[PDB]
Design an enzyme around this catalytic site. Structure first.
Site, PDB file in Angstrom:
ATOM      1  N   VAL A 212       0.811  -1.209   0.000  1.00 37.82           N
ATOM      2  CA  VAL A 212       0.000   0.000   0.000  1.00 37.82           C
ATOM      3  C   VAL A 212       0.849   1.266   0.000  1.00 37.82           C
ATOM      4  CG1 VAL A 212      -2.071  -0.960   1.049  1.00 37.82           C
ATOM      5  CG2 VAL A 212      -0.239  -0.176   2.484  1.00 37.82           C
TER       6      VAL A 212
ATOM      7  N   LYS B 104       4.781  -2.479   8.251  1.00 31.95           N
ATOM      8  CA  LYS B 104       5.814  -1.626   7.689  1.00 31.95           C
ATOM      9  C   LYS B 104       7.179  -2.318   7.861  1.00 31.95           C
ATOM     10  CE  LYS B 104       7.995   2.897   8.499  1.00 31.95           C
ATOM     11  NZ  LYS B 104       7.823   4.245   9.108  1.00 31.95           N
TER      12      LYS B 104
ATOM     13  N   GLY C 143       8.977   3.461  -0.248  1.00 29.58           N
ATOM     14  CA  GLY C 143       9.917   4.573  -0.273  1.00 29.58           C
ATOM     15  C   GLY C 143      11.234   4.295   0.439  1.00 29.58           C
TER      16      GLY C 143
ATOM     17  N   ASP D 232       2.820   9.062  11.422  1.00 28.95           N
ATOM     18  CA  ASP D 232       3.700   9.620  10.422  1.00 28.95           C
ATOM     19  C   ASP D 232       3.714   8.617   9.276  1.00 28.95           C
ATOM     20  OD1 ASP D 232       5.955  10.612   8.918  1.00 28.95           O
ATOM     21  OD2 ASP D 232       6.485  11.854  10.691  1.00 28.95           O
TER      22      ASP D 232
ATOM     23  N   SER E  61       8.600   0.171   3.302  1.00 26.48           N
ATOM     24  CA  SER E  61       7.437  -0.232   2.517  1.00 26.48           C
ATOM     25  C   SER E  61       6.372  -0.770   3.481  1.00 26.48           C
ATOM     26  CB  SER E  61       7.798  -1.349   1.530  1.00 26.48           C
ATOM     27  OG  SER E  61       9.166  -1.287   1.134  1.00 26.48           O
TER      28      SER E  61
HETATM   29  C1  LIG Z   1      12.256   7.667  12.216  1.00 25.60           C
HETATM   30  C2  LIG Z   1      10.779   7.777  12.609  1.00 25.60           C
HETATM   31  C3  LIG Z   1      10.469   8.002  13.937  1.00 25.60           C
HETATM   32  C4  LIG Z   1       9.143   8.133  14.315  1.00 25.60           C
HETATM   33  C5  LIG Z   1       8.113   8.053  13.376  1.00 25.60           C
HETATM   34  N1  LIG Z   1       6.865   8.188  13.867  1.00 25.60           N
HETATM   35  N2  LIG Z   1       6.534   9.097  14.677  1.00 25.60           N
HETATM   36  C6  LIG Z   1       5.249   8.951  14.989  1.00 25.60           C
HETATM   37  C7  LIG Z   1       4.435   9.835  15.983  1.00 25.60           C
HETATM   38  C8  LIG Z   1       5.057  11.176  16.385  1.00 25.60           C
HETATM   39  C9  LIG Z   1       3.057  10.131  15.438  1.00 25.60           C
HETATM   40  C10 LIG Z   1       4.303   9.011  17.262  1.00 25.60           C
HETATM   41  C11 LIG Z   1       4.788   7.869  14.308  1.00 25.60           C
HETATM   42  C12 LIG Z   1       5.817   7.421  13.546  1.00 25.60           C
HETATM   43  N3  LIG Z   1       5.833   6.280  12.797  1.00 25.60           N
HETATM   44  C13 LIG Z   1       4.787   5.625  12.261  1.00 25.60           C
HETATM   45  O1  LIG Z   1       3.643   6.071  12.272  1.00 25.60           O
HETATM   46  N4  LIG Z   1       5.089   4.453  11.698  1.00 25.60           N
HETATM   47  C14 LIG Z   1       4.296   3.560  11.074  1.00 25.60           C
HETATM   48  C15 LIG Z   1       4.396   2.235  11.521  1.00 25.60           C
HETATM   49  C16 LIG Z   1       3.624   1.231  10.929  1.00 25.60           C
HETATM   50  C17 LIG Z   1       2.740   1.541   9.879  1.00 25.60           C
HETATM   51  C18 LIG Z   1       2.625   2.860   9.413  1.00 25.60           C
HETATM   52  N5  LIG Z   1       1.794   3.172   8.359  1.00 25.60           N
HETATM   53  C19 LIG Z   1       0.485   2.844   8.300  1.00 25.60           C
HETATM   54  N6  LIG Z   1      -0.220   2.510   9.421  1.00 25.60           N
HETATM   55  C20 LIG Z   1      -1.519   2.190   9.360  1.00 25.60           C
HETATM   56  N7  LIG Z   1      -2.183   2.208   8.185  1.00 25.60           N
HETATM   57  C21 LIG Z   1      -1.556   2.531   7.047  1.00 25.60           C
HETATM   58  C22 LIG Z   1      -2.258   2.542   5.842  1.00 25.60           C
HETATM   59  C23 LIG Z   1      -1.588   2.882   4.652  1.00 25.60           C
HETATM   60  C24 LIG Z   1      -0.236   3.217   4.629  1.00 25.60           C
HETATM   61  N8  LIG Z   1       0.372   3.551   3.444  1.00 25.60           N
HETATM   62  C25 LIG Z   1       0.464   3.215   5.853  1.00 25.60           C
HETATM   63  C26 LIG Z   1      -0.193   2.873   7.063  1.00 25.60           C
HETATM   64  C27 LIG Z   1       3.425   3.865  10.016  1.00 25.60           C
HETATM   65  C28 LIG Z   1       8.421   7.828  12.022  1.00 25.60           C
HETATM   66  C29 LIG Z   1       9.773   7.702  11.646  1.00 25.60           C
END
Ligand SMILES: Cc1ccc(-n2nc(C(C)(C)C)cc2NC(=O)Nc2cccc(Nc3ncnc4ccc(N)cc34)c2)cc1
Ligand SMILES: Cc1ccc(-n2nc(C(C)(C)C)cc2NC(=O)Nc2cccc(Nc3ncnc4ccc(N)cc34)c2)cc1
Ligand SMILES: CCCCCCCCO[C@@H]1O[C@H](CO)[C@@H](O)[C@H](O)[C@H]1O
Ligand SMILES: CCCCCCCCO[C@@H]1O[C@H](CO)[C@@H](O)[C@H](O)[C@H]1O
Ligand SMILES: CCCCCCCCO[C@@H]1O[C@H](CO)[C@@H](O)[C@H](O)[C@H]1O
Ligand SMILES: CCCCCCCCO[C@@H]1O[C@H](CO)[C@@H](O)[C@H](O)[C@H]1O
EC number: 2.7.11.24
Lengths: 337, 339
Positions: B27, B50, B30, B165, B34
């Site tokens: 879905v 992820k 990058g 994020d 992924s």
């Molecule tokens: C290096 C780094 C550090 C922190 C983050 N980060 N930070 C945050 C906050 C501040 C909001 C707590 C959140 C993240 N990371 C994050 O959200 N990661 C993450 C983990 C697992 C899955 C996803 N992405 C998705 N999650 C749920 N549904 C999705 C649907 C579609 C899609 N393309 C992605 C999804 C993101 C991201 C990167």
């Protein structure tokens, strides 16, 4: 047409549009000086290269035109691109200074080989990208001639770009024919450098750490062996042939034994790059299709240069004409998206 | 009690995951990683998996991997992404090279919504309340989001919002606080409140508040609304050249927001006034905003929690790749799923 401001930085005058701020010298010499800067329009760090005495010699005038013309046409992920070019001058009469602007490179490849023991996949990805940018550079009839880890910018994501940082000894990555003052040489010289770089990514150390050019050549013969009869048939220089023919025979070492920790596909490719006879070296385009890069290779995404001639040795003009040619290329410049 | 893993290749990418996770389909992709949607057979939930890209290939990647795992392991709040699972195919530290993060699968982001409906005032109330409730929590752990924008806010069919994020590689610059673009070298949490103000404005009007084409344009558009800096604020800029520069601009007055956002709830306008202040020291905080009369239907001072203490001391450490990897591995091993 921006507002320019003027400052001095280490006994050199810097006249630059307002958009670039916090100019900080990051290097200088007889080719130019570079400042790191903050690009207020984009928020990116940029490198601003002021060319040195661009029109004070015919050779300088020529270099000035060649660099701008080349860089204006370099549009490839693994090659430095031009973000901006400007001059404080308002017309051709006042035109005596040119500044080139690109994305600031933080880290080079040498920063990377000195920090960690590279895995095979990391070596595949880095050498793939070198070869991909080189295929593109070579397709324009450009030879890099100074490929070495310090001319290879690598970001946090291991995305690599070839630049020329000139303003880790060059001799270490240099094809033997250059050290021997060969009449002509060709783009295969840069493949030799890639061989030296790949070896160093595989072992962590400089392959041929010569102290001078003759030590350099000695270390090379030790690994790859003395020239064969086929290669000797192609040496025009009598005194060179005489000298080379005097040497005691040295056998080619077994690379699989030298590089005992490496992937055999990696060893095979090194054997195809580090060959004395430049005619027998693998080309950048051929090396892209080598099995070692099977996880990376995409023949439909390894592009070649645009049609503008970048190899125009024959043109024998005067400073004034090189000057106006340069001035035209500055005025016609269109920024990348 | 190690699960059994199956392997498949999706998009030149190997996905090796426990059998519980079925029906992987990609879905997003990058430089950072992924993502595949999947069905978690254990729980009956749709999840996002992820796979981090090149997690230990550089010092920067290694510390990012650790940073992301630590942060996601900490976040336990209804309006913030939570970690359902974290796993690796590796059986030992010496094998450890791949990290996978699992969360609830998000349907749409807030961006999909603003495009697709004119929102009622109760609807804006609910969405903005939930952003600030999550932000209050994140800010309480001394985390700054820095990239709040509609594409980083997931919203389910029941209008329930989570901050995350989504980034894996609608411009960020549009929601970015003016001091971040000024390169102010020591900014703080109040940058996220700016962003929330920009997002709320867009929910009320249906259009980007400040759709700048670059950083300069962005700043121009901002000043057309909030006005060129006051005497108070100019005094906080210690650069003579900066001061004289701003002073040489055509001076823009502050617009009265009540006169800009026509037909909006007067309380929403008052709240936006408090969020979109140039001087960051003067912006309302997330905790304060929750108590604004705009949210009287939603506000509950006993149901707006703060985070447990978050040890961010690693951020200031400079460590080896195999050290970051070992620490990440400790966190993989110590993970306890949410009930
Ligand atoms: C290096 C780094 C550090 C922190 C983050 N980060 N930070 C945050 C906050 C501040 C909001 C707590 C959140 C993240 N990371 C994050 O959200 N990661 C993450 C983990 C697992 C899955 C996803 N992405 C998705 N999650 C749920 N549904 C999705 C649907 C579609 C899609 N393309 C992605 C999804 C993101 C991201 C990167
Ligand atoms: C006469 C002439 C002609 C061409 C080149 N040339 N060739 C190439 C290839 C073959 C790789 C496309 C590149 C150049 N020139 C070139 O790189 N110029 C240039 C322009 C602007 C800035 C810089 N340098 C730097 N760029 C980014 N980050 C830097 C960080 C530090 C530092 N010392 C220099 C930087 C170089 C160089 C000289
Ligand atoms: C003592 C070490 C011997 C050095 C031998 C270097 C051989 C270089 O290779 C030579 O390159 C030339 C220039 O591009 C070609 O014209 C020749 O055909 C090729 O054999
Ligand atoms: C193609 C090679 C032609 C030039 C090679 C000449 C380099 C000679 O080699 C040098 O010369 C000394 C004797 O003259 C030797 O004692 C040393 O090995 C070395 O310093
Ligand atoms: C349009 C004119 C540019 C505005 C430049 C603002 C940059 C402010 O920059 C900041 O100023 C503070 C002043 O004391 C310092 O504390 C910070 O260290 C500095 O980063
Ligand atoms: C060109 C328009 C000027 C925009 C000025 C933005 C002022 C931002 O606000 C500033 O943020 C800094 C970073 O946290 C704080 O340290 C300062 O106290 C605060 O005044």
């Amino acid at each position: 047409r921006p507002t320019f401001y003027r400052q001095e930085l280490n006994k050199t005058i810097w006249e630059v549009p307002e958009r670039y701020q916090n100019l900080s010298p990051v290097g200088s010499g007889a080719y130019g000086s570079v400042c790191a800067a903050f690009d207020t329009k984009t928020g990116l760090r940029v490198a601003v290269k002021k060319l040195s005495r661009p029109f004070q010699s015919i050779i300088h005038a020529k270099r000035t035109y060649r660099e701008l013309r080349l860089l204006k046409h370099m549009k490839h992920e693994n090659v430095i691109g031009l973000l901006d070019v400007f001059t404080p001058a308002r017309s051709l009469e006042e035109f005596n200074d040119v500044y080139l602007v690109t994305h600031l490179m933080g880290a080079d490849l040498n920063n990377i080989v000195k920090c960690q023991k590279l895995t095979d996949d990391h070596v595949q990805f880095l050498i793939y990208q070198i070869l991909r940018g080189l295929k593109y550079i070579h397709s324009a009839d450009i030879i890099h001639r100074d490929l070495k880890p310090s001319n290879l910018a690598v970001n946090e994501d291991c995305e690599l770009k070839i630049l020329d940082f000139g303003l880790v000894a060059t001799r270490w990555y240099r094809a033997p024919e250059i050290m021997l003052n060969w009449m002509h040489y060709n783009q295969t010289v840069d493949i030799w450098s890639v061989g030296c770089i790949m070896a160093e990514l595989l072992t962590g150390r400089t392959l041929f750490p010569g102290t001078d050019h003759i030590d350099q050549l000695k270390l090379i013969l030790r690994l790859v062996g003395t020239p064969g009869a086929e290669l000797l048939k192609k040496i025009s220089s009598e005194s060179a042939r005489n000298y080379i023919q005097s040497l005691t025979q040295m056998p080619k070492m077994n690379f699989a034994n030298v590089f005992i920790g490496a992937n055999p596909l990696a060893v095979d490719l090194l054997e195809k790059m580090l060959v004395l006879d430049s005619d027998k070296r693998i080309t950048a385009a051929q090396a892209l299709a080598h099995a070692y890069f099977a996880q990376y290779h995409d023949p439909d995404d390894e592009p070649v240069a645009d049609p503008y001639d970048q190899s125009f040795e024959s043109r024998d003009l005067l400073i004034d004409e090189w000057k106006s040619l340069t001035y035209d290329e500055v005025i016609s410049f269109v920024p990348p998206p």
